[PDB]
Amino acid sequence: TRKTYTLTDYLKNTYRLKLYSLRWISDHEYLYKQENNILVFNAEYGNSSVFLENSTFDEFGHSINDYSISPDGQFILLEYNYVKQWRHSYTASYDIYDLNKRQLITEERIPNNTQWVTWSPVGHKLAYVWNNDIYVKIEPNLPSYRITWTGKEDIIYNGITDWVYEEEVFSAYSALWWSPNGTFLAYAQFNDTEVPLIEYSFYSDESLQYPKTVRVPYPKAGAVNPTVKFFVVNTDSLSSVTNATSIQITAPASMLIGDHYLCDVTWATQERISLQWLRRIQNYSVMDICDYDESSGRWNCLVARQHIEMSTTGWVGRFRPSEPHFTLDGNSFYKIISNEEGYRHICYFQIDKKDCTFITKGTWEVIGIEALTSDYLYYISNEYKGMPGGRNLYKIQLSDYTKVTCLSCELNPERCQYYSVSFSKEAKYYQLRCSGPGLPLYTLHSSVNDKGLRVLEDNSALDKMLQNVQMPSKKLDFIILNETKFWYQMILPPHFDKSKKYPLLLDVYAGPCSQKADTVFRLNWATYLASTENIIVASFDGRGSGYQGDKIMHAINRRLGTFEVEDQIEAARQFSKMGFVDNKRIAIWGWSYGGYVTSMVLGSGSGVFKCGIAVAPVSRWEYYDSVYTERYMGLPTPEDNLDHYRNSTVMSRAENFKQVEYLLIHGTADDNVHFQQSAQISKALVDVGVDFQAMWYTDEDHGIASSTAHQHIYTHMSHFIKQCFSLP
Amino acid sequence: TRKTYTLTDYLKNTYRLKLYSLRWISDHEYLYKQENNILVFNAEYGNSSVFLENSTFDEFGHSINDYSISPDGQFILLEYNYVKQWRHSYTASYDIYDLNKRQLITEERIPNNTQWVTWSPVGHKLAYVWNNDIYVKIEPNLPSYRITWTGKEDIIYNGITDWVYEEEVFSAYSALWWSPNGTFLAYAQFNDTEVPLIEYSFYSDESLQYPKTVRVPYPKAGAVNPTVKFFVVNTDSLSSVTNATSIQITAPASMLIGDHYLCDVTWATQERISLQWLRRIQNYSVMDICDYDESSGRWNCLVARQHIEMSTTGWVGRFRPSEPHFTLDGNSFYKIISNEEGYRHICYFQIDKKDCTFITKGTWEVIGIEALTSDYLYYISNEYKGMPGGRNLYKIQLSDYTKVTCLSCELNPERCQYYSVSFSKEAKYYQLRCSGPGLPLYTLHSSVNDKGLRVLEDNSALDKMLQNVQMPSKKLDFIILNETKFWYQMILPPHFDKSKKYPLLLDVYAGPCSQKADTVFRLNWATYLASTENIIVASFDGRGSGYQGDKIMHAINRRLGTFEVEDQIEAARQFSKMGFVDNKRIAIWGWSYGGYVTSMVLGSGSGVFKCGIAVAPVSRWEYYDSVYTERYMGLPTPEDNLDHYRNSTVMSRAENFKQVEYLLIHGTADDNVHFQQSAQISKALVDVGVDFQAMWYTDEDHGIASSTAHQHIYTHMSHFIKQCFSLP
Ligand SMILES: CS(=O)(=O)c1ccc(C2NOC([C@@H](CC3CC3)[C@H](N)C(=O)N3CC[C@H](F)C3)N2)c(F)c1
Ligand SMILES: CS(=O)(=O)c1ccc(C2NOC([C@@H](CC3CC3)[C@H](N)C(=O)N3CC[C@H](F)C3)N2)c(F)c1
Ligand SMILES: *[C@@H]1O[C@H](CO)[C@@H](O[C@@H]2O[C@H](CO)[C@@H](O)[C@H](O)[C@H]2NC(C)=O)[C@H](O)[C@H]1NC(C)=O
Ligand SMILES: *[C@@H]1O[C@H](CO)[C@@H](O[C@@H]2O[C@H](CO)[C@@H](O)[C@H](O)[C@H]2NC(C)=O)[C@H](O)[C@H]1NC(C)=O
Ligand SMILES: *[C@@H]1O[C@H](CO)[C@@H](O[C@@H]2O[C@H](CO)[C@@H](O)[C@H](O)[C@H]2NC(C)=O)[C@H](O)[C@H]1NC(C)=O
Ligand SMILES: *[C@@H]1O[C@H](CO)[C@@H](O[C@@H]2O[C@H](CO)[C@@H](O)[C@H](O)[C@H]2NC(C)=O)[C@H](O)[C@H]1NC(C)=O
Ligand SMILES: *[C@@H]1O[C@H](CO)[C@@H](O[C@@H]2O[C@H](CO)[C@@H](O)[C@H](O)[C@H]2NC(C)=O)[C@H](O)[C@H]1NC(C)=O
Ligand SMILES: *[C@@H]1O[C@H](CO)[C@@H](O[C@@H]2O[C@H](CO)[C@@H](O)[C@H](O)[C@H]2NC(C)=O)[C@H](O)[C@H]1NC(C)=O
Ligand SMILES: *[C@@H]1O[C@H](CO)[C@@H](O[C@H]2O[C@H](CO)[C@@H](O)[C@H](O)[C@H]2NC(C)=O)[C@H](O)[C@H]1NC(C)=O
Ligand SMILES: *[C@@H]1O[C@H](CO)[C@@H](O[C@H]2O[C@H](CO)[C@@H](O)[C@H](O)[C@H]2NC(C)=O)[C@H](O)[C@H]1NC(C)=O
Ligand SMILES: *[C@H]1O[C@H](CO)[C@@H](O[C@@H]2O[C@H](CO)[C@@H](O)[C@H](O)[C@H]2NC(C)=O)[C@H](O)[C@H]1NC(C)=O
Ligand SMILES: *[C@@H]1O[C@H](CO)[C@@H](O)[C@H](O)[C@H]1NC(C)=O
Ligand SMILES: *[C@@H]1O[C@H](CO)[C@@H](O)[C@H](O)[C@H]1NC(C)=O
Ligand SMILES: *[C@@H]1O[C@H](CO)[C@@H](O)[C@H](O)[C@H]1NC(C)=O
Ligand SMILES: *[C@@H]1O[C@H](CO)[C@@H](O)[C@H](O)[C@H]1NC(C)=O
Ligand SMILES: *[C@@H]1O[C@H](CO)[C@@H](O)[C@H](O)[C@H]1NC(C)=O
Ligand SMILES: *[C@@H]1O[C@H](CO)[C@@H](O)[C@H](O)[C@H]1NC(C)=O
């Protein structure tokens, strides 16, 4: 008997995955949300107390979306009226509650429609962006100091990013950086005056008589990009002068010669800041390190401290130049860069010496630097067992690089191979977060001796429930293509029998530096398909995929829509030759880049696939944004890479779609991959007389994450897959 | 053994109906285009001559879209660079060729991007509109006179109509009216300053990087409407030294009190013009009769010559007040109006007498007045055999109304029951166009003795081809509902066998004053469905339908989405109870108003229909234009008819779609029924978890008629219907 994992189970979230989200507030205390109220926990012993009882804001008159405690614990920022914008941006209202007097501040309050707010790293100073201008409050109940007057809707952005910087450069909306002790406030200013606008309709609720036209500054490939400027203001002088001066720090001459980007800002000390700039042609970046000059009140970046990072085989960085991690005295820093072999490792830099020293090496890569103390550097890599899809925490002794300890590898090797970490303020404690291949496991550890303090959440409740269900299994392995290994994973149906022919669905993404083959545990649509529909769901990381060196990642440089597309087809062949795949029932599907690859694959004329589903796909690179697209494709001009731009479109393969069943889906309010992209695919298919299935989702964006739409799209896709595989 | 009428046959027009479109140029001659040659025919004998060689412009260097010979035969206007706009509007380039001197005028030529152009009714003067302003050319080779200078894109229209006037009032882009002999040129001016704009994306060719946004002044129900003014200018006294003077004729005070419309302009004589005005609440209209005052130079409209036309059960006229047909001296006129019984008949009016006399009467209606002489008035009505879906030509003796003669009834009763007609200049000759139930038949007749001169086109070629294919038959009949009879038609499959059960598709439109049950012969999608798929395609005219009196037509007044929807369900219900219908396979489909009714039906919960297809449907009346919507629904305010505006939406019925298969289709560039309407339907279905099929057509408008799109929609719908009926 035993029920299987059904579509409803996924859509209704019957089997809930538990997690343990904590927020360190010091070197040994963290906050945890247990039953609406906020408790504070002692890391050392595990005892807690009620920090803020849930019944505190009952008669607030508003539903509170999130909170934020000032560094000194004296105040708490309350956020409500949350109105989402793009991937990271949103607007909201805020009130400050005085935790000492247990009162709600009612004077000089933060304006409504505040675009971004942030406490100073120390104390309780506040900085926020409202109407595209920056303001600063030294004290929560005192008036604000205006920092900028140039703010202008869709034109000038001070302290916040425009659309493309938020999405492709900073993975954030804020563009301001408090110095370590809060004295200085740095920030970027974006000018989109000449940036073309993407325009599309938003219908809103039925009650809106006339549709609204959403207009946003968005640079498509080869178009005019926003320009940027960087400034630094001394907040400590605000109460002493009428208008504190924003000292500007200009980009290096090597950047000013053409279009460029401000791509990283990292403070090194109270009076030292590092900036990384990137040329519009993303294979050259410069890092300036600037010191405050107490005599001229100016900021100077000595060329002797400038560092150049370039790439001859591709772009710089996985998605951008990596962040530096400075030693306390700010005289040296560690940074991940690809070595002579093409693998990303940690290099140790002296701020005024151009030659760095690699402290790690091998045919594997460092994923990120997680913490740095005067004695140790902690990082996550995929070195363990040579599995690029695994992740573990490591510790390296700064006084002896030959001393490297893996802190997570052997904790529970069968259940935990994909780790994440969170250190306390001074890295005295760290929470480990295991996400697979077994059920997620959260543990707390002491850094002084790397001893396990205790288990925070083991997901026993769910393990219990899953016992009464025929869950699918997952296989992570590899195939060798041209003396090089390529990893794939398969979500196999329960009681899998290799003596049978199962229908196969290729789950694909395959964009640059992607990884669809890993050791993470997921409860998703593929779970339902394998468990209930007895469908094998596979994923393959071929050329262009990440975390396996530049040889593989830069294979698609300037050539998107080629190798990553072909390898995916070859993967299908390879799978069919494994003998447990029904060659007559092989389907392919993907979202976003996966939608593009799926479409390109369905229109290649390979004959391997019977049907496929593309959700919010890219159809021609000239329609996607500049930062992302140009990174891999360069410029769409005849003197650069225009020919391949025009050669890698979905539309040019419309005719071959007569050989397959296709389902095209897109959200009408997708601000990322514009509906325009599918509108052009559909028109090309209509023009050559090809029938296909389509579905638009009114007012949904790139994620189609709305509760109702989410249930609707997966239901619709399920019927299509079952029909194509005629289950029925 | 005899093929059937296939989908390809319909889509490739393999079976073409022959026509015979002629143009009367005098009381005894007409122009007919043959082999691209313009021939002139003598109506009395049938002899012809070549009027213009198909090779005359053999090296014109432009594709000629259309041509237009001046009334005096001296010149010919050549139209090229045609670019379509809405239903009737478009811009083009023109050149004038001198027929007498066989030369192409090259001096003072009409501008490119001209919006409208027309010859004076007599002679060869010209009036064209360019950049929203009116120009007049007394001679083809002479400079033109600027009449208006207020022209402004999307704001002020002179001589041309705005979006709503073009579509809902004049069924023409043109807004200028030449006096009978060309002395005066009357014109209307529209002001859309405060009219909101409908905005939508147009994607264009793949090469366009950024979608363009189209915006057109379009007043939705309740919104601010455009205002109108009327002017008359003397084209005989124009000066190259002074700006033309236009005399304004203001609307009556009973109209100026509130919002209103100019709905008809008709010249009575060389110096008398009639105008009809309609209040925004379309149940009260006023006709003004204005005479030119030679001494004053002004136009006066005596209040004593004012005629009011109102309605207590509904709006005025079928879609607007009918046009008057003045006698030679202009002292009296005939006009179709609804009588005390609610049936539309011809009433004889004296210009200075309030009461008019009806000259026809009966439980049938006059469709239109076609020609008037001192002895006879010719008209088309559905009186014959009491069939409201039949049309015949009649003449009534103006000196003895008891003497009524049908001129088309008995010509060929089996083959011809639906005629339209074309009279020559003085009604000396008329062409009859029979369009059903048999193949179209065109004939020429002489009025003096109503003789049948000859057959112009009998479609004997098509008849010879059609006998080689198993064509379906059409049954026109009626059912009774509450002592009232309602007509329906059924397209029955070849070799119809009433002992068998056939699936049934209800083809519906059902908008106010519509007629889907008639005797017209058609080669369409239904032909293929019955001939090849053996599906019965039925249509029904319930409450709200036209040509049967106001008791029926006005039944849905201020109540759209009620009785016309309910009656369709009743009809299907009754057809389902017939021996030859498979009550398990009953479908419904419609386009435009038919899309709305199909949707309202599917969301009714009647359980009668298994599936349905809605193309470019209206979903809520507040989204449609003011002129058409308010005509039937009044204003959407709480004081007027808001409750019913809110109760008649498709969206409120979403939940009821759970038990039916629904395919929703709409073109993204529909300027008439905005994509918005379908976008809200899909969102409501998604919001209640109901699955359905959808298809958008990039850049297609309300007609979805581009060649490839047309083939694609009918192909996609064919698969859907066959699948719903389990048909191979
Ligand atoms: C885990 S996965 O499914 O393999 C996966 C999924 C998604 C990405 C990925 N790559 O670029 C993005 C993301 C920026 C990134 C957030 C910082 C990018 N901007 C994006 O959304 N698109 C849309 C079209 C094209 F695919 C790029 N997201 C990725 F690298 C890997
Ligand atoms: C011959 S039929 O299929 O019954 C038929 C088809 C179409 C009409 C009809 N009614 O109003 C229009 C047309 C007026 C202009 C005269 C052309 C109107 N504006 C329209 O396109 N819509 C869209 C939504 C709503 F249904 C009305 N067309 C009609 F009265 C009858
Ligand atoms: C966790 O429990 C410990 C032990 O009871 C608390 O320790 C406080 O430690 C300080 C420093 O020595 C003493 O002054 C206090 O007397 C101790 N607590 C008390 C009430 O006496 C600690 O406060 C607890 N932490 C939390 C978050 O509950
Ligand atoms: C944003 O950049 C634009 C340039 O595109 C700047 O606009 C120029 O400003 C100068 C001086 O005011 C004028 O002479 C030019 O006419 C402007 N050009 C344009 C496009 O109009 C603008 O000043 C910048 N804004 C800020 C705050 O730096
Ligand atoms: C604060 O100082 C800044 C820096 O000068 C002022 O910004 C200048 O304002 C003037 C006049 O408004 C403009 O001509 C300049 O273009 C502005 N410069 C910049 C950097 O934008 C700002 O107006 C001052 N505010 C107050 C209240 O004095
Ligand atoms: C935060 O760092 C700033 C920058 O060094 C400190 O301000 C300097 O303080 C020294 C005294 O130690 C003075 O000589 C300088 O004039 C100050 N410079 C500036 C720009 O203010 C500041 O004292 C530090 N804050 C704290 C709380 O330690
Ligand atoms: C069209 O009709 C107008 C108006 O009746 C004619 O113009 C009148 O002609 C008479 C005879 O010459 C003059 O006495 C009047 O003063 C004219 N009135 C106006 C308003 O112009 C005109 O002749 C006719 N045009 C044609 C071509 O027959
Ligand atoms: C034209 O129709 C309107 C609207 O139906 C009539 O005006 C009034 O409409 C309201 C509802 O909107 C009713 O309560 C009134 O009874 C209607 N009559 C009056 C006098 O207000 C109007 O009567 C109609 N005109 C004609 C000639 O029938
Ligand atoms: C049709 O035929 C008649 C003669 O049968 C043609 O002739 C008439 O017009 C000619 C010039 O227009 C004259 O030369 C004839 O005298 C005159 N004959 C009669 C009886 O009126 C007439 O033009 C022909 N029409 C066409 C269009 O070809
Ligand atoms: C077209 O209509 C507009 C608006 O009704 C007319 O303009 C006016 O409305 C303005 C408010 O937007 C008032 O401020 C103006 O006083 C009023 N009149 C003028 C001349 O501005 C406009 O005149 C109309 N245009 C024409 C050519 O008739
Ligand atoms: C309308 O456009 C046409 C085409 O551009 C103009 O005709 C000429 O076209 C030739 C080439 O086709 C050009 O060299 C000329 O510049 C155009 N103009 C002339 C006078 O030769 C035409 O003139 C335009 N007319 C108007 C009123 O816009
Ligand atoms: C906090 O609130 C939750 C839900 O409102 C409740 O279950 C819990 O008992 C509350 N605890 C306290 C201390 O108020
Ligand atoms: C924010 O909006 C609320 C809602 O009207 C208003 O009452 C409040 O005063 C506003 N606060 C500020 C700082 O503007
Ligand atoms: C950067 O890439 C461009 C495009 O291939 C190339 O022309 C240039 O030489 C590269 N620069 C470096 C430093 O590799
Ligand atoms: C005129 O051209 C057409 C083709 O456009 C041709 O069929 C016809 O023969 C020509 N006319 C004559 C009289 O030859
Ligand atoms: C005609 O009127 C327009 C509109 O004001 C004006 O600009 C033009 O100069 C006038 N021309 C003559 C000849 O009066
Ligand atoms: C008569 O029939 C109509 C439908 O044809 C129905 O709506 C009405 O209620 C019935 N009774 C009366 C009195 O009209």
Curated annotation (Swiss-Prot), chains A, B:
The active site is at S592, D670, H702. Monomer. Homodimer. Heterodimer with Seprase (FAP). Requires homodimerization for optimal dipeptidyl peptidase activity and T-cell costimulation. Found in a membrane raft complex, at least composed of BCL10, CARD11, DPP4 and IKBKB. Associates with collagen. Interacts with PTPRC; the interaction is enhanced in an interleukin-12-dependent manner in activated lymphocytes. Interacts (via extracellular domain) with ADA; does not inhibit its dipeptidyl peptidase activity. Interacts with CAV1 (via the N-terminus); the interaction is direct. (Microbial infection) Interacts with MERS coronavirus/MERS-CoV spike protein. Inhibited by GPC3 and diprotin A. The extracellular cysteine-rich region is necessary for association with collagen, dimer formation and optimal dipeptidyl peptidase activity. GO terms for molecular function: aminopeptidase activity; chemorepellent activity; dipeptidyl-peptidase activity; identical protein binding; protease binding; protein homodimerization activity; serine-type endopeptidase activity; serine-type peptidase activity. Changing H712A: Inhibits weakly homodimerization and dipeptidyl peptidase activity. InterPro entries: AB_hydrolase_fold (IPR029058), Pept_S9_AS (IPR002471), Peptidase_S9_cat (IPR001375), Peptidase_S9B_N (IPR002469), Serine_Prot_S9B/DPPIV (IPR050278). Expressed specifically in lymphatic vessels but not in blood vessels in the skin, small intestine, esophagus, ovary, breast and prostate glands. Not detected in lymphatic vessels in the lung, kidney, uterus, liver and stomach (at protein level). Expressed in the poorly differentiated crypt cells of the small intestine as well as in the mature villous cells. Expressed at very low levels in the colon. Belongs to the peptidase S9B family. DPPIV subfamily. One of its GO terms (biological process) is cell adhesion. It comes from the Eukaryota. Residues 1-728 are extracellular. Glycans are attached at N47, N54, N112, N181, N191, N243, N283, N482, N647. The gene is DPP4. This is Dipeptidyl peptidase 4. The soluble form (Dipeptidyl peptidase 4 soluble form also named SDPP) derives from the membrane form (Dipeptidyl peptidase 4 membrane form also named MDPP) by proteolytic processing. Disulfide bonds join C290-C301, C347-C356, C406-C409, C416-C434, C611-C724. It is a single-pass type II membrane protein. Changing N181A: Does not inhibit dipeptidyl peptidase activity, interaction with ADA and homodimer formation. Its main location: membrane. Its EC number is 3.4.14.5. Keywords: Aminopeptidase, Cell adhesion, Cell junction, Cell membrane, Cell projection, Disulfide bond, Glycoprotein, Host-virus interaction, Hydrolase, Membrane, Protease, Receptor, Secreted, Serine protease, Signal-anchor, Transmembrane, Transmembrane helix. Changing N191A: Does not inhibit dipeptidyl peptidase activity, interaction with ADA and homodimer formation. Changing H712E: Inhibits strongly homodimerization, dipeptidyl peptidase activity, interaction with CARD11 and T-cell costimulation activity.
